[PDB]
C-alpha cells in the first residue's frame, strides 16, 4: 500500500528538498511507498501555514514533514495537538510540552552553556536575534544569575568586551565581525562562539575573522563512515536534478531532513508490523470543524515516531516522550590555523564537554 505524507517547505529551501528526495529513494522499501504531497510557502506567514496544514489534513495525510519559524511555531504545535497530526521537523526545538511534534534538531543550549564554562568565561556578550526562539537567551541569563557571569545581551535583530557569542542568522555574523575588524583594537584578541549546529556549513567560515579565536558546533561528523558514504554519493549528484547537491558538505538542516525520512520510514514499518492501519480512505474532512474530532490512529503514529532509534547523518537519533532528541552528541569545533577541527564533544547523557 501507499502511505500519504505531507511536506511543508520554506521557499528557497532547495537543498533540504533535495535531501528529502534523496532520503525517499534511499529508504524506499518493498513493504509500502510514501506518497508525499509537497507544498512550498513562506513559513513566517501563520495564515499560509494554516492553509497548507489544512490542505494536507483534508487529503488525509498520516504525518507532515516540515519547517516553521518563530512566527508560525504556535500554529503548528496547536494544530498538530488539536488534530493529532504528527509534525516531524528540522526547525528549532522548543521546550514546551508539545504532543504530536517530532523535533529532529537536538537542543544546543546545554552544549553552549558547557562550552562557556569550558573556556572559563565569566564576562561576555551574547548577540542574538529571535529567529530560533528565546529559550537560549533565557538559559544564558538564568545561568548568568546562578553563576555570577556578567553578560551583555543585545538583540541584533567603545567597549573592552572580547568574548562574544553570536546566536543570529548567518547574514548578521558577517556584519558584526566586520565591524570588529577595522576597529583594529585587538582583532586577534577576540573569541567568537557561533551558536549554531553547522560550524562548517555554507559561507560562515568564508568570513575573515582576522586571526580571532572562533568556536562552534557540528552535529554532522564527516569522519563518520555513514556520513562519508553519503557525501560520496551526494557530491556526485546532478545539481540540475538535485539543486543544492553536488557539494562536499551538507547543511545540518538538510542532513536532518534526510534523517527525518529514515525516522518516518522506520515508524511506518513498525506500525505495519503491529497491523495498525496506515493507508486509509476517505473523505477530506473539515480543518476548522466543530467539534474538533481528531484521528484515532494519530496517537499510535505519534508513538511509533517517538520510539524510533536509528543512526543517521546527525548521529544517534532517539527521542523522549515529548519528541525531543536525547542521547545525541554535539561536536565541539574550533577554527585552527589549518582549518576547522573537532576538539571534543558534548553528550546529552553526560552533559559535559569531553576533550579530544
In sequence order, which residues have a C-beta less than 8 Å from that of residue 142 and are 6 or more positions away?
none
Q: Which of 103, 213, 262, 265 binds ligand NAG (CB under 6 A)?
A: 213
Picked from a copy of itself, ligand NAG, none, the partner binding residue 191 (CB below 5 to 8 A depending on kind) is ligand NAG
| Residue 150 interacts with a copy of itself (CB under 8 A): yes or no | yes
Binding piece for ligand NAG, criterion CB under 6 A, among 9-17, 56-64, 165-173, 184-192: 184-192
- For ligand NAG, the closer of residues 203 and 320 by Cβ is 320
Q: How many Å apart are CA 205 and CA 146, to the nearest integer? A: 33
Decide: is 143 part of the binding site for ligand NAG (CB under 6 A): no
- Hey, which residues does 214 pair with through a beta bridge? 192
Q: Which range touches a copy of itself (CB under 8 A), out of 101-109, 149-157, 293-301, 326-334?
A: 149-157
Q: What angle do CA 261, 264, 266 make, to 5 degrees?
A: 105
With contacts defined by CB under 6 A, name the span among 24-32, 80-88, 138-146, 186-194 that binds ligand NAG. 186-194
Among 63, 64, 83, 108, binds a copy of itself (CB under 8 A): 83
- Pick out residues in 60-119 that bind ligand NAG (CB under 6 A): none
Going residue by residue from 305 to 324, which x/- string records binding to ligand NAG, judged by CB under 6 A? -------------x------
Comparing CB distances to ligand NAG, the nearer of 33 and 336 is: 336
Tell me the CA end-to-end span of the chain in Å, nearest whole number. 48
d(CA 64, CA 75): 14
Q: How many residues does the chain have?
A: 356
CB nearer to ligand NAG: give 24 or 326: 326
Q: At what angle do helices 73-83 and 46-58 cross, to 10 degrees?
A: 30
DSSP class of residue 15 equals H
Least CB distance to a copy of itself at residue 272 (A): 30
Half-sphere exposure of 254 (CA within 13 A, CB side): 25
Contact (CB, 8 A) for 76 and 68: yes
Q: Which is nearer to a copy of itself, 33 or 147 (CB)?
A: 147
**Cell numbers representing residue 262 in the block:** 529514515
Choices 19-27, 33-41, 200-208, 289-297 (CB under 8 A): range interacting with a copy of itself = 289-297
Binding partner selected for residue 294 from a copy of itself, ligand NAG, none, CB under the kind-specific 5 to 8 Å limit? none
Stretch that binds a copy of itself, among 13-21, 42-50, 198-206, 255-263 (CB under 8 A): 42-50
Q: Cα–Cα distances in Å, from 206 out to 230, 285, 318, 333, 348? A: 24, 50, 33, 16, 30
* Cis bond before residue 282 (omega within 30° of 0): yes
Helices 252-273, 298-306: crossing angle, 10 deg rounding = 120
Query: Contact at 8 Å (CB) between 235 and 272?
Result: no
Distance CA 169, CA 325 (A): 23
From candidates 81, 99, 189, 294, binder to ligand NAG by CB under 6 A = 189
Residue recorded with cell 586577534: 188
Q: Does 75 bind a copy of itself (CB under 8 A)?
A: yes
* Chain positions contacting a copy of itself, by CB under 8 A: 45-48, 50-51, 54, 71-72, 74-75, 77-79, 81-83, 130, 134, 137-138, 141-142, 144-146, 148, 150, 152-155, 159, 284-290, 292
* Chain positions contacting ligand NAG, by CB under 6 A: 162-163, 189-191, 213, 318, 326-327, 349
Amino acid at each position: 500500500n501507499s502511505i500519504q505524507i505531507g511536506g511543508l517547505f520554506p521557499r528557497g529551501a532547495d537543498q533540504e528538498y533535495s535531501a528529502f528526495r534523496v532520503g525517499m529513494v534511499q529508504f524506499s522499501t518493498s513493504e509500502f511507498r510514501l506518497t508525499p504531497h509537497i507544498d512550498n510557502l513562506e513559513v513566517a506567514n501563520s495564515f499560509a501555514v494554516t492553509a497548507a496544514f489544512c490542505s494536507q489534513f483534508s487529503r488525509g495525510v498520516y504525518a507532515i514533514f516540515g519547517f516553521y519559524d518563530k512566527k508560525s511555531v504556535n500554529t503548528i504545535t496547536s494544530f498538530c495537538g488539536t488534530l493529532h497530526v504528527s509534525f516531524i521537523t528540522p526547525s528549532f526545538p522548543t521546550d514546551g510540552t508539545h504532543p504530536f511534534v517530532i523535533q529532529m534538531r537536538p537542543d544546543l543550549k546545554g552544549a553552549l552553556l558547557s562550552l562557556i564554562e569550558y573556556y572559563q568565561w565569566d564576562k561576555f556578550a551574547y548577540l542574538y536575534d529571535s529567529d530560533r526562539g528565546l529559550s537560549t537567551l533565557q538559559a544564558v541569563l538564568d545561568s548568568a544569575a546562578e553563576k555570577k557571569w556578567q553578560v551583555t545581551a543585545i538583540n541584533v535583530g567603545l567597549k573592552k568586551e572580547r568574548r562574544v557569542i553570536l546566536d543570529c542568522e548567518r547574514d548578521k555574523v558577517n556584519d558584526i565581525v566586520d565591524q570588529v575588524i577595522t576597529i583594529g583594537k585587538h582583532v586577534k584578541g577576540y573569541h567568537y562562539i557561533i551558536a549554531n549546529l553547522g560550524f562548517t556549513d555554507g559561507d560562515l567560515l568564508k568570513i575573515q575573522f582576522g586571526g580571532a579565536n572562533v568556536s562552534g558546533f557540528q552535529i554532522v561528523d564527516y569522519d563518520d563512515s555513514l556520513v562519508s558514504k553519503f557525501i560520496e554519493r551526494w557530491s556526485t549528484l546532478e545539481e540540475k536534478e538535485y539543486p543544492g547537491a553536488h557539494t562536499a558538505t551538507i547543511k545540518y538542516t538538510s542532513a536532518l531532513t534526510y534523517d527525518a525520512v529514515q525516522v518516518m520510514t522506520e515508524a511506518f514499518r513498525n506500525l505495519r508490523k503491529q497491523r495498525i492501519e496506515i493507508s486509509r480512505r476517505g473523505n477530506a474532512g473539515d480543518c476548522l470543524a466543530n467539534p474538533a474530532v481528531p484521528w484515532g490512529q494519530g496517537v499510535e503514529i505519534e508513538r511509533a515516531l517517538k520510539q524510533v532509534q536509528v543512526e543517521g547523518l546527525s548521529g544517534n537519533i532517539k527521542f523522549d516522550q515529548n519528541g525531543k532528541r536525547i542521547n545525541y552528541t554535539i561536536n565541539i569545533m574550533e577554527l585552527k590555523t589549518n582549518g576547522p577541527r573537532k576538539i571534543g564533544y558534548w553528550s546529552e547523557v553526560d552533559k559535559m564537554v569531553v576533550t579530544l
